[PDB]
Amino acid sequence: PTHLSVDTKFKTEGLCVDIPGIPKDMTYRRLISMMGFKMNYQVNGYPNMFITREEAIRHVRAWIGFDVEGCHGTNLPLQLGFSTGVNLVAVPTPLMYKGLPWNVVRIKIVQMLSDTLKNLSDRVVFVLWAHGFELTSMKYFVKIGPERTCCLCDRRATCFSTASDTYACWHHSIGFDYVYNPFMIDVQQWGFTGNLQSNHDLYCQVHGNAHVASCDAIMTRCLAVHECFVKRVDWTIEYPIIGDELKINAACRKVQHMVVKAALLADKFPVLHDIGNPKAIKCVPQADVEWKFYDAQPCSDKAYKIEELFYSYHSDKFTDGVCLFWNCNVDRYPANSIVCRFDTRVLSNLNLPGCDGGSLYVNKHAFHTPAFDKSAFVNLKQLPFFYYSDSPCESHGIDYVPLKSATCITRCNLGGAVCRHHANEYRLYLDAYNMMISAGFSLWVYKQFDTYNLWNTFT
Ligand SMILES: CC(=O)Nc1ccc(Oc2ncccn2)cc1
Numbered sequence: 276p277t278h279l280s281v282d283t284k285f286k287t288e289g290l291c292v293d294i295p296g297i298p299k300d301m302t303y304r305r306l307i308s309m310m311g312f313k314m315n316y317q318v319n320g321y322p323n324m325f326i327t328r329e330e331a332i333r334h335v336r337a338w339i340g341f342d343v344e345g346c347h348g349t350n351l352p353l354q355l356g357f358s359t360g361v362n363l364v365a366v367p368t369p370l371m372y373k374g375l376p377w378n379v380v381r382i383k384i385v386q387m388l389s390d391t392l393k394n395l396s397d398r399v400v401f402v403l404w405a406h407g408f409e410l411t412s413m414k415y416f417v418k419i420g421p422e423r424t425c426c427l428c429d430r431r432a433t434c435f436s437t438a439s440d441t442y443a444c445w446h447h448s449i450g451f452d453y454v455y456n457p458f459m460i461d462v463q464q465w466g467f468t469g470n471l472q473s474n475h476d477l478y479c480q481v482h483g484n485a486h487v488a489s490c491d492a493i494m495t496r497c498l499a500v501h502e503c504f505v506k507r508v509d510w511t512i513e514y515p516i517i518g519d520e521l522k523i524n525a526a527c528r529k530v531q532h533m534v535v536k537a538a539l540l541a542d543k544f545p546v547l548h549d550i551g552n553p554k555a556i557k558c559v560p561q562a563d564v565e566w567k568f569y570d571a572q573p574c575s576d577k578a579y580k581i582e583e584l585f586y587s588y589h590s591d592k593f594t595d596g597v598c599l600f601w602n603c604n605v606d607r608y609p610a611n612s613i614v615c616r617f618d619t620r621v622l623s624n625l626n627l628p629g630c631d632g633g634s635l636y637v638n639k640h641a642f643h644t645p646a647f648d649k650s651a652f653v654n655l656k657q658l659p660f661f662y663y664s665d666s667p668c669e670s671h672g673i674d675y676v677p678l679k680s681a682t683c684i685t686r687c688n689l690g691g692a693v694c695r696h697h698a699n700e701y702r703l704y705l706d707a708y709n710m711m712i713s714a715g716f717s718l719w720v721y722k723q724f725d726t727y728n729l730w731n732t733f734t
């Protein structure tokens with residue numbers, strides 16, 4: 276059972292207001308035919324337009340919410356809404372566009388999907404709360420057939436052009452007019468009571484209902500993200516590399532070792548409380564400190580309440596030494612903390628919009644992250660950039676312009692002239708640091724943290 280069988284039953288009750296008289300007994304096979312598409316008994320990689328919840332989860336980067344509303348069928352204008360916030364009006368003669376015939380609407384659809392998805396996925400997954408008009412509008416902008424490759428590259432085809440009779444991926448589809456072999460999933464098939472707004476509003480206050488198709492499209496995709504990544508979490512699913520994943524993860528480890536190593540040297544805490552991932556390793560293995568670990572998996576719904584993580588009876592005295600929260604999201608960090616908190620508002624190809632202000636950060640695995648909250652950091656301050664090193668000043672082994680920086684905390688800089696080795700390492704560290712920050716990570720530290728305390732470790 277890799278794919279969804281076309282002979283699987285589809286509950287049609289949600290469809291009967293737009294499609295009155297629709298049979299109760301319905302399969303995907305019959306529904307696809309009713310949508311005006313012909314499958315022709317084809318064993319060519321596209322067995323069904325519809326996919327399973329498990330196939331949808333593996334392809335979350337392709338999710339595009341889609342809703343169609345009657346503007347007043349046949350000669351009835353339709354408002355096509357997408358979770359990108361776009362509303363297009365198709366005539367059969369929060370951005371709102373005036374009514375235009377399908378021949379030009381389809382060009383806009385292909386441009387919009389290609390720009391949204393080219394750096395995210397090899398396909399499109401239309402996320403629906405199906406009532407009828409969305410399924411019946413598909414024939415006007417969608418073509419299907421065997422799985423194909425792009426005319427200009429090796430990627431799978433996502434678009435077709437009637438002008439040239441050719442196929443293209445999201446990167447080479449300029450001027451293309453048809454969406455080719457898209458996928459779709461109907462959230463109503465999952466078993467819900469009541470309408471879309473009543474199910475969406477149970478878990479989210481950020482998306483409102485301005486009574487337009489894009490609002491419904493956004494709510495549908497949000498509800499799907501909540502069901503698949505908030506109330507149900509699967510960290511075994513692997514996602515492909517689409518950007519700077521490897522560099523970001525390597526930078527995260529480098530910055531963690533740097534910041535924790537310097538905090539221990541500058542303030543000499545006798546104990547460190549490491550709160551978070553149950554598979555955590557000591558990030559500063561040579562430190563003298565009593566290292567104590569506390570298990571907490573990544574919170575995907577609301578940030579952990581500090582009172583539940585720490586109280587209800589471990590050193591028990593979390594107030595002793597320092598607390599390390601490396602991507603362990605809490606409502607209010609204690610004053611004696613070293614913190615790395617992912618900022619959900621960051622715009623990137625790894626960060627997808629999520630539920631109730633949260634975001635879906637997809638880097639090797641998918642992590643729904645609760646909304647970034649500035650009040651969580653009131654007992655702390657932003658951690659400034661700095662580079663520290665106690666390693667010998669020795670080159671061993673890329674040209675050189677002399678480094679001058681007040682934040683290069685090394686013996687050579689204390690001595691008045693940064694050596695080549697420490698200048699190379701500083702610049703590499705700065706690149707890693709900027710990579711991590713730009714990926715959305717934010718760093719916070721206890722107010723007494725002062726890098727001036729690091730210079731005296733060079734005696
Ligand atoms: C072993 C491991 O990978 N641990 C882990 C993963 C994700 C974590 O939350 C998170 N949230 C947003 C951005 C990044 N990370 C926390 C810890």
Ligand SMILES: [Zn+2]
Pocket residue numbers: 425426427428429430443444445446447
């Ligand atoms: Zn291509």
Ligand SMILES: [Zn+2]
Pocket residue numbers: 475479480481482493494497498629630631
């Ligand atoms: Zn929402």
Ligand SMILES: [Zn+2]
Pocket residue numbers: 667668669685686687688693694695696697
């Ligand atoms: Zn040096």
